[PDB]
From a paper:
5-HT3Rs are expressed either as a homopentamer consisting of subunit A or as heteropentamers of subunit A in combination with other subunits (B, C, D, or E). 5-HT3Rs are widely expressed in both the central and peripheral nervous system, and form a part of the brain–gut circuitry that directly control peristalsis, emetic reflex, and visceral pain perception. The 5-HT3R antagonists, referred to as “setrons,” are the standard first line of therapy for the prevention of chemotherapy-induced emesis. Granisetron is a competitive antagonist that inhibits serotonin-activated currents at nanomolar concentrations.
In the present study, we have solved the structure of the full-length 5-HT3AR bound to granisetron at 2.92 Å resolution. According to this 5-HT3AR-granisetron structure, residues from loops A, B, and C on the principal (+) subunit and loops D, E, and F from the complementary (−) subunit form an enclosure around granisetron. The cationic center of granisetron is a tertiary ammonium in the bicyclic ring (pKa 9.6) and is positioned at the deep end of the pocket nestled by Trp156 (loop B), Tyr207 (loop C), Trp63 (loop D), and Tyr126 (loop E). However, in comparison to serotonin, granisetron is larger in size and extends further outward into the subunit interface such that the aromatic indazole ring is oriented parallel to the membrane and makes a cation–pi interaction with the positively charged nitrogen in the guanidinium group of Arg65. Granisetron’s position also requires Arg65 (loop D) and Trp168 (loop F) side chains to reorient. Instead, an alignment of 5-HT3AR-granisetron with the 5-HT3AR-apo structure shows a counter-clockwise twist of β- strands in the ECD, leading to a small inward movement of loop C closing in on granisetron. The loop C conformation in 5-HT3AR-granisetron, although open, is distinct from other antagonist loop C conformations because it lies between the open position of loop C in the 5-HT3AR-apo structure and the closed position in the 5-HT3AR-serotonin structure. The TMD of 5-HT3AR-granisetron is rotated clockwise compared to 5-HT3AR-apo, once again in a position between the apo and serotonin-bound structures. Although granisetron induces a rotational movement in the TMD, the pore radius is comparable to 5-HT3AR-apo and the permeation pathway presents barriers in all the three domains. Thus, the 5-HT3AR-granisetron structure represents a non-conducting conformation.
Author numbering:
A (entry chain C), B (entry chain B), C (entry chain A), D (entry chain E), E (entry chain D): 7 to 335, 397 to 462
């Protein structure tokens, strides 16, 4: 022999090599690949289309008896790079695929001198999962990635793990944070899927668990909803017989009705109807509608509509009571007949103004009482919302 | 002979193999492929472009007399993996294609020892279908997938099924739910398409039938439309001679006119005009316009416009009737001439106020009667809408 | 000889075959391809980018003297499938390309025993054309598809038709309807393009003619524009001295000014300015502005602004005329000096109210006359619009 | 010899041909390619991303001494088609690339009998350029396309032109018009780029110059801005003591403030701040704000706020002047004490009404004068805008 | 020997060359590649997805002992072009990849006569980085590009620099400006990443540092926020007892509440909550709400609500003080009983008007004082904003 270089090893073990055969001596022995996965980024979550988009780093090794050499008589070389398109590579795919993500190809693999061939590749994957939007900003999502051979059965290709599942689960080394989703764990699980008798497939199932960071939807949702309550609370201080109080309240209701629709496009809702945020917005609207209807009732109650006297059943029910329940406090005959008519024409205007003053007195007491009831209702709703947030926030 | 391995089988039957020929001994015998399909996901439905996007799992087998071996004298091997790019593969396409979906390639096939070669592959397909939007949230869609050989005729390539059509039709095993579309059935149908005499093609036609889940468009459509009726019903309680009732009603009409346009972009409408939802919105607007015109009529009827007396033809037509149809109830001479002028200057103001009070009395009776008629009309429309929904919802 | 199979024919005529040469015996004879096209779908029309996107079915045949065999002594085979990547294929492209559409490849062709090789393929094409938007919902579009060889000249590759042009023009067999565009005809035309002397190219030019279905833009354009006229016609019935009539009219003008802008994004306009729909909207706004200015004029005319008496030049011009043109109908001396001052303080208030009543009488007659003129103008515009639509609709 | 066909020429000169070598006999002689370009379409201009997208037609030829034959003894053939993937092709790229546009490949080239090999190909290119938006609808853009070899130096590959630069510059034969951009010229320029000593590269630089057609942004910008001035000019005719004049002006300011924001998204602005159109809109808003502030000043000046008498310093400054500057014009004693009190209670109401009438008289003269000043200011702005447009429009 | 050409060199050193082996004589010696990078364009920055998109120019060289020749006896050739797909190329990738950018391939490399093979290629790269939006328009971003071999270890492939790091850092020669991001420096850094013992990888880490040009978000943010303060300052000059002052203020608050939401979509916010711009907008709203509440307080204070006399505790607290703190200043008996009643009916109306005048006098002094306080608060906020901008702007 001689020494051209140590490309004569690669000449030795790729001369008569057939990349089509499953590389075993005895065909009864399965090829056992050993995989694991580290998660790199969560690229997209489509809650409408039920489609997850991540990016992982992937590696695998297997053993073949056709890529073996003694490490002596080749100047002590124990591993080398072989191009990927010249050896047998197993078809390990994902069941949950809905599309093909673009990922760089890696043109080389390692091969040790026992036949342990190692493959390293990054791969973008676009999978489909069931996403629960029962509670939109505070939600964990449990997505599956099932690695399986698409053709070969479990007596043909078998799948194990590279390393221990306790350290696959607790691995957050290169995950890109600051990206709306916190990784929690990547839990592997082995299952043998049998489609029927005598055809069973090896599957390795990774459960990724991600939690949404709720800080995004606390300035885009909680701020204008809490904000348009203080405009109501200021707008109750308008006197009801002005006329612009109704125009105030309907303008503010218009301003919030625009807000609900301009929010409801950027917040998805799938297979349930609405989350609890939709219930809290309906309660926020039910407060504002009765805030409007109270002003409509007082403006109806306080007007000049040639109306009758206030009822003494409901005068001492309301003025003497509500200051102690809550609040507190021959020609001379002709001239006589001419003057009596002028006195009568003035006293009826005087009486019709005193009736209006009594109804205006009833209306302000009611507008104070209903304002107290509304203020305590808004306060009791706000403390319920805070004490429901603090149960989540603590631990 | 000897024993290198059992790659010598693959050396035996791929040495002089030609992947260009249609692999039969007698050229008069057609190659019969046997296909079936399980549906995985409905990715998109473009009602505007009439384009469906699904993702299926696909499999097929056929027989070739060039891939046969005796299972003895090869150490009892009965099947093996052969790369896909080294054997003849039929060109089974879809007639309804409009684009190419990205799908992973599967580089291996099984080959049994009789020549039964099996191919498993997933494939994303983007097809075109006719979509009826006659009833937008409650609609089934009947889409076709016609598998056919694009070149070969029925004496050259023939298409059958893998398994029975009764179990292709009732197969929902891996379909991704929670995704706006329920699968109902995938019904296969064989047809021999003859383009003319002496050129006929085999076609296998799958009819997928999907039904939209109507829960999405019942919180984005039914909630604000039913919601802006209660603002009208509250807004009738304003007294009409205030002036802000008209400003209330036109603001609410503005608020719903924004709503119709901001909805009509996210709801498609194709080849029919509108669905029935568009008719129900036009009726919802026809109620609101007459709600506006009633207030315009009462505000015209109740004003101070130096107007004449109320007509006694229509005074006892309206006050004595509508409380029983529906509702219920030398210097002394100079001073005399000076005082009579002051009495005359006051009595005309008194008369012009009593005329205005009589017209204000007519206006409130009309505003009560028209409010009752409007409330019963809205109630009779709502119960018709409920009893049309309950026919769909039951069974 | 013997009988392996009839793959020995494909061994016979693809052994020493060179797929690079233009396959003729005499190099002076041109290769004549024969093409035709059936239209399948109109996928997109971008009026802004001037880009058409269709999907066609395409087929072609040509003759080569290197793929010939006698049908005897091969067990009577007269045609067979040959892979596409092993024979010469002409480069027939489109001049109007701006991009590459994704289309499935067809890996096989037929070859008859005279050398007639037939190719069938579907192809998505994205071309560029000039689109006229002079009349937006009622428009035909005349788009060209010029098939030509990109390199070879007319003494090298020549292009004819498969079948007669009278039956290419009248072919609507597989076109997908219900898709905003009706196909009308696909008219072929042969032209020899000479770029200069001694370099001429064969071109086959298909003119596709498509017509838009105008039903889409008759519920999204004609309905709110005709709708916001009846709100004006109702809003004239408000009495002008109320104060909320101006607030009515400016709110309705705001509501239509939002409508024009929220429509003008989804309706394109290219190289002309606007279509006639833009002129009809400007006339619709010119009616609404004079509807506003009439109310401004009457509200200016009817007010209490310490104004003078109505002019008798224009009192009998307007009250006696317009009911026949159109409408119809020592201490006693001290007390005397005290009372005369009170009479004088009342008679000036009486006079200042009678002046206001006379101006209020003029204002209502003008508000009736201008309402009649506006109603007849709107009616004369609507019948002109109907009689312009009916010329299009008939035949 | 014999005559199979004239594929024996292609057998002769592609038998031992190496497509990897730069095809020259003497390695010191550079390969001179000769290129030119005709512009077909301007597909997109992203002013935000500074990215141009065009579509050109491209051609080039070069000479190689390995593709030569005598035209005799091959039956007088002087040119033939050779596939592109079998000869040496230079790497001519563009420096300004930011992406890869999709373009059809052309699989054949011509080769003459001297070695002149001609290549024709269309190519979509996506380049980056500096875009000036100093004047948005009236702007020319000067974009560069630098053709260069990406690897080879000027003693290895050299670049010249096909034809004369005077006829490359004036070539508008197949450009697609009606597409928002007029082509003006495509000016070529040769530069030898030397990165350092002893490494210089040949570059051929095409300057495309395109001009925007300003007709698009004259109906979407100039029409509502000129339109909302006439609503102001009509709205000055409201009498200021009505109360709805302020509600008119703020509603119109709201309507234009919506307009500015809903325009400012579809008009880009990059590296300068704003164009001059942004300055003209700020002046359009500065007119409308002082139109609002004038009404606020008159409404403050005309009210009933228990105010004092008009100042005689500013009464003859304003009523006697502005009609010549611009505009034009024992018991009897008890009854006496009772009546004197009634006279005193009426004369103070009379005085407080005459004071209000004098302030109302001052307010109308000011509302006429400021309306004249505002009308002349709007007219002087409009004629300045017209005489700045007409300088551009003429020649 | 003879002279065909100098393609016999390429015949000499690519005849028995194996492109799969790592090209060294002694396998213990690592292949040292030498890279550097010049930055060309910043294509996109997604602050939501944390994804950077740039375009660089890249070059590298390495040494191989299999591509060596003596420059004599080949007619003095010292370098030549070899196709890329025929030699060994190292796999230098980026750790921060999330996708594959489209970049043109370069089909040739240089090879010198010592084996120094040089590779030039442009490459679009889409990477992921952490982006801080703590201060949105004034922010630098520190993004990493880690070049590493994806498979080979540091005894197999090693990475150095082409040129000195001081001139890689200060290199801005071909960067495309005018594009929202200024390049500052590209700083290289070498690190040996050891994943565990006996497996270490060579990494070359480039830190690109880019700064946003803040001029874009100073006309789209600072202009309407500073603009809607002057509308408030004008709107305080309305007299509070008019009624349209409240309708002014709530319309302006509506107009700014639309503005905040229509801005907040085009300005991202990630992992922090909000930048300081969000705090400045909340302060801008806190000024406008107290501007509204002041008008509500004065309108409540100034009305006719059958109210009592102004308190003398707070009359000399406010009228005598605030003009020195800030601002400045038998039948005759029957007729007697008839007249005394008329005097009494007038004097109570007189008293109820004088009470309203005293409250109107208090309200205007308060409306002046609060206007001065609000104007000084807005001025003190504006100068704080200017003196915080000028610290950034200086040097
Ligand atoms: C579509 O446009 C083409 C324009 O090229 C029309 O062109 C003419 O077609 C006739 C035959 O139909 C030729 O004889 C003329 O020479 C063509 N004229 C030109 C200027 O090219 C074609 O008729 C149009 N089709 C329709 C339906 O309008
Ligand atoms: C064709 N041209 C030739 C020289 C000018 C630009 C192009 C591209 C190419 N240049 C370059 O590739 C290039 N130049 N410099 C200074 C660099 C620094 C770091 C990385 C690459 C480069 C070769
Ligand atoms: C080489 C060979 O023939 N092996 C076995 C044979 O011993 C038995 C038979 C029964 O199935 O199966 C096979």
């Amino acid at each position: 022999t001689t020494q051209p270089a140590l490309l004569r090893l690669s000449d030795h073990l790729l001369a008569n090599y057939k990349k089509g055969v499953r590389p075993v001596r005895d065909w009864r022995k399965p090829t056992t690949v050993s995989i694991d996965v580290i998660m790199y980024a969560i690229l997209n979550v489509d809650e409408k289309n039920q489609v997850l988009t991540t990016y992982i780093w992937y590696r695998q090794y297997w053993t073949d008896e056709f890529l073996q050499w003694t490490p002596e008589d080749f100047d002590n070389v124990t591993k080398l790079s072989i191009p990927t398109d010249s050896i047998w590579v197993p078809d390990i795919l994902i069941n949950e695929f809905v599309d093909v993500g673009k990922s760089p190809n890696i043109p080389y693999v390692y091969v040790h001198h026992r036949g342990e061939v190692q493959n390293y590749k990054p791969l973008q994957l676009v999978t489909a999962c069931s996403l629960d939007i029962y509670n939109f900003p505070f939600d964990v999502q449990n997505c599956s990635l099932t690695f399986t051979s698409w053709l070969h059965t479990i007596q043909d290709i078998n799948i194990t793990l590279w390393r221990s599942p306790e350290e696959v689960r607790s691995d957050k080394s290169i995950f890109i944070n600051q990206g709306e989703w916190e990784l929690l764990e990547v839990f592997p699980q082995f299952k043998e899927f049998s489609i029927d008798i005598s055809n069973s497939y090896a599957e390795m199932k990774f459960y990724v668990i991600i939690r949404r960071r709720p800080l995004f939807y606390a300035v885009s949702l909680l701020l204008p909803s809490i904000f348009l309550m203080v405009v109501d609370i200021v707008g109750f201080c308008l006197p009801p017989d002005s006329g612009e109080r109704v125009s105030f309240k309907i303008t503010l209701l218009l301003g919030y009705s625009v807000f609900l629709i301009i929010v409801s496009d950027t917040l998805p809702a799938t297979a349930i109807g609405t989350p609890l945020i939709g219930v809290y917005f309906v309660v926020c609207m039910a407060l504002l509608v009765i805030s409007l209807a109270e002003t409509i009732f007082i403006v109806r109650l306080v007007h000049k509509q040639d109306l009758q006297r206030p009822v003494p059943d409901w005068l001492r029910h309301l003025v003497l009571d509500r200051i102690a329940w809550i609040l507190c406090l021959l020609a001379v005959r002709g001239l006589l007949q001419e003057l009596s008519s002028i006195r009568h024409f003035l006293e009826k205007r005087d009486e019709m103004r005193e009736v209006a003053r009594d109804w205006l007195r009833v209306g302000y007491v009611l507008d104070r009482l209903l304002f107290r009831i509304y203020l305590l209702a808004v306060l009791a709703y706000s403390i319920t919302l805070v004490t429901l947030w603090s149960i989540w926030h603590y631990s």
